[PDB]
Amino acid sequence: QGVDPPPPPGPPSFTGTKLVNDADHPWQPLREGDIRGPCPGLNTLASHGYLPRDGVATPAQIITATQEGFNFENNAAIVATYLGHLLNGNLVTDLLSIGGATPKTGPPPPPPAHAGGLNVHGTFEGDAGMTRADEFFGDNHSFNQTLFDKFVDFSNRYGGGFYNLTVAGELRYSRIQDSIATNPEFQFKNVRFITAYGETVFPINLFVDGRVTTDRKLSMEDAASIFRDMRFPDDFHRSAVPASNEGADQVLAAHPWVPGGNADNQVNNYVEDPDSADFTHLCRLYEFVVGSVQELYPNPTGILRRNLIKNLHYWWTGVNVAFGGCDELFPYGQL
């Protein structure tokens, strides 16, 4: 009949560096039924047992795993996790797939809600990623070697053979241009416009070993290990401080860009959307997502309504801080 979802964990008691690729968290191969998806962070946490190895977890489990494994900052974890859960998880069982659809998330919600997992395109997952291809080309979740070869190429061209903040700026822009030129359904607005800049610095802030204090840069070997194999580098130590999207601003500044998309199902036809969230209008992302949730859940009652109310509030607790203050919305009233 369902679960009563607890509030998110706070930051970890210990926030320093530590060995996370340790004897208790060994890499293991996929078994039948195990789910993996478009996020190399969650994928690696699952394949080392920081998350359930089957790739289905509670919000609380995801938050604690991102903190334990990578020192992902608490509010960034809350913002990402409840966004993913509201849109793509099962609110009644309190379970989210980190990939595609699975019976492991329990009885399906009422359509148009789906609990289809992080693989679901168009409100969270989106276009112009680093190692995943746009959904238009048929697969938005698998590692793509051609794209990784570009990652390596740009690292050679701008980062001395390593991925650093200069590389991030160049790659992000070039990937947007690729999608403009080749994907007639290319969208780069609302959630995706914001998350895409954060994700380009996570490799620097979170995939670089925490004992590297200066000149933080990621080797192609370490990049392949995480992005392709879902495996921590040998002896991997997490960031020495909670971290998330530091430097994303510089990535945008290197190639200023405006949210929008290819209009009218044509390539090379990018039109700005002035209503979209952007980095000086972050609260629009909050409002947009709450609207999306209402479309998924037009008239909930009982446990589903209760858990929607709680999850919306949990998400707001992170958004309020991360976005610098947003008025909470109550589309379903209060408990």
Ligand X SMILES: *[C@@H]1O[C@H](CO)[C@@H](O[C@@H]2O[C@H](CO)[C@@H](O[C@@H]3O[C@H](CO[C@H]4O[C@H](CO[C@H]5O[C@H](CO)[C@@H](O)[C@H](O)[C@@H]5O)[C@@H](O)[C@H](O[C@H]5O[C@H](CO)[C@@H](O)[C@H](O)[C@@H]5O)[C@@H]4O)[C@@H](O)[C@H](O[C@H]4O[C@H](CO)[C@@H](O)[C@H](O)[C@@H]4O)[C@@H]3O)[C@H](O)[C@H]2NC(C)=O)[C@H](O)[C@H]1NC(C)=O
Ligand Y SMILES: *[C@@H]1O[C@H](CO)[C@@H](O[C@@H]2O[C@H](CO)[C@@H](O[C@@H]3O[C@H](CO[C@H]4O[C@H](CO)[C@@H](O)[C@H](O)[C@@H]4O)[C@@H](O)[C@H](O[C@H]4O[C@H](CO)[C@@H](O)[C@H](O)[C@@H]4O)[C@@H]3O)[C@H](O)[C@H]2NC(C)=O)[C@H](O)[C@H]1NC(C)=O
Ligand Z SMILES: O=Cc1ccc(CO)o1
Binder of residue 202, out of Mg ion, ligand X, ligand HEM, none (CB less than 5 to 8 A by kind) = ligand HEM
Which residue's CB is nearer to ligand X, number 160 or number 302? Answer: 160
224 burial (CB, 10 Å; 0-12 / 13-18 / 19+) is middle
Put residue 268 in one of left, alpha, beta given phi > 0 → left and psi -120 to 50 → alpha.
left
Q: Of residues 229-268, which lie at the interface with ligand Z (CB under 6 A)?
A: 244-245
Sequential DSSP letters for 141-154 = SS--HHHHHHHHHH
- Return the number of other C-beta atoms located less than 10 Å from residue 77's C-beta: 24
For the CB of residue 177, give the shortest distance to Mg ion in the complex, in Å.
16
Q: Which of 144, 195, 225, 320 binds ligand Z (CB under 6 A)?
A: 195
For the CB of residue 175, give the shortest distance to ligand X in the complex, in Å.
18
Residue type for 330, please?
F
Instruction: Could you list the beta-strand ranges (E) of the chain.
Output: 56-57, 96-97, 187-188, 260-262, 270-272
Binder of residue 160, out of Mg ion, ligand Z, ligand X, none (CB less than 5 to 8 A by kind) = ligand X
131 labeled part of a ligand binding site: yes
Q: Which residues of 30-65 are buried (b: 16+ CB within 10 A; e: fewer)?
A: eeeebbbbbbbbbbbbbbbebbbbbbbbbbbbbbbb
Which segment (48-56, 163-171, 260-268, 272-280) binds ligand X by CB under 6 A? Answer: 163-171
**Computed from CA positions of residues 304, 309, 313, 316, in that sequence, does the dihedral angle turn out positive or negative?**
positive
Q: Of residues 122-141, which lie at the interface with Mg ion (CB under 5 A)?
A: 125, 129, 132, 140
Say whether residue 184 binds ligand Y (CB under 6 A). Answer: yes
Say whether residue 159 binds ligand X (CB under 6 A). Answer: yes
| Chain centroid, CA 62 distance in Å | 11
Q: Which of 86, 91, 92, 130 binds ligand HEM (CB under 6 A)?
A: 130
126 labeled part of a ligand binding site: yes
Interhelix angle for 74-88 vs 302-322, to 10°? Answer: 150
Which residue's CB is nearer to ligand Y, number 139 or number 328? Answer: 139
SS3 state at 250: helix
| Chain centroid, CA 123 distance in Å | 12
Q: Of residues 166-225, which lie at the interface with ligand X (CB under 6 A)?
A: 166, 215
Say whether residue 154 binds ligand HEM (CB under 6 A). Answer: no
230 labeled part of a ligand binding site: no
Q: Of residues 12-41, which lie at the interface with ligand HEM (CB under 6 A)?
A: 38-41
Q: Which two tokens stand for residue 166?
A: 């200069």
Q: Of residues 75-104, which lie at the interface with ligand HEM (CB under 6 A)?
A: 77, 80-81, 84
The residues with which 97 forms a beta bridge, in sequence order, are 56
Residue that the structure tokens 């929008």 belong to: 260
Instruction: Please report, for residues 199, 303, 319, 320, the alpha-carbon distance to residue 315 in angstroms, rounded to integers and kept in the order given.
Output: 19, 18, 6, 9
Binder of residue 328, out of ligand Y, ligand HEM, ligand X, none (CB less than 5 to 8 A by kind) = none
Binder of residue 288, out of ligand X, ligand HEM, ligand Y, none (CB less than 5 to 8 A by kind) = none
39 labeled part of a ligand binding site: yes
First vs last Cα of the chain: how many Å apart?
18
Binder of residue 261, out of ligand Z, ligand HEM, ligand X, none (CB less than 5 to 8 A by kind) = none
Q: Which residues belong to the annotated binding site for heme b?
A: 39, 126, 130-131, 192
Query: Which residues of the chain form contacts with ligand Y (CB under 6 A)?
Result: 133, 137, 139, 144, 146-147, 181-182, 184, 267
Query: Which residues of the chain form contacts with ligand HEM (CB under 6 A)?
Result: 38-42, 62, 66, 70, 72, 77, 80-81, 84, 118, 124-126, 129-132, 199, 202-203, 206
Query: Which residues of the chain form contacts with ligand X (CB under 6 A)?
Result: 159-160, 164-166, 215
Query: Which residues of the chain form contacts with Mg ion (CB under 5 A)?
Result: 125, 129, 132, 140
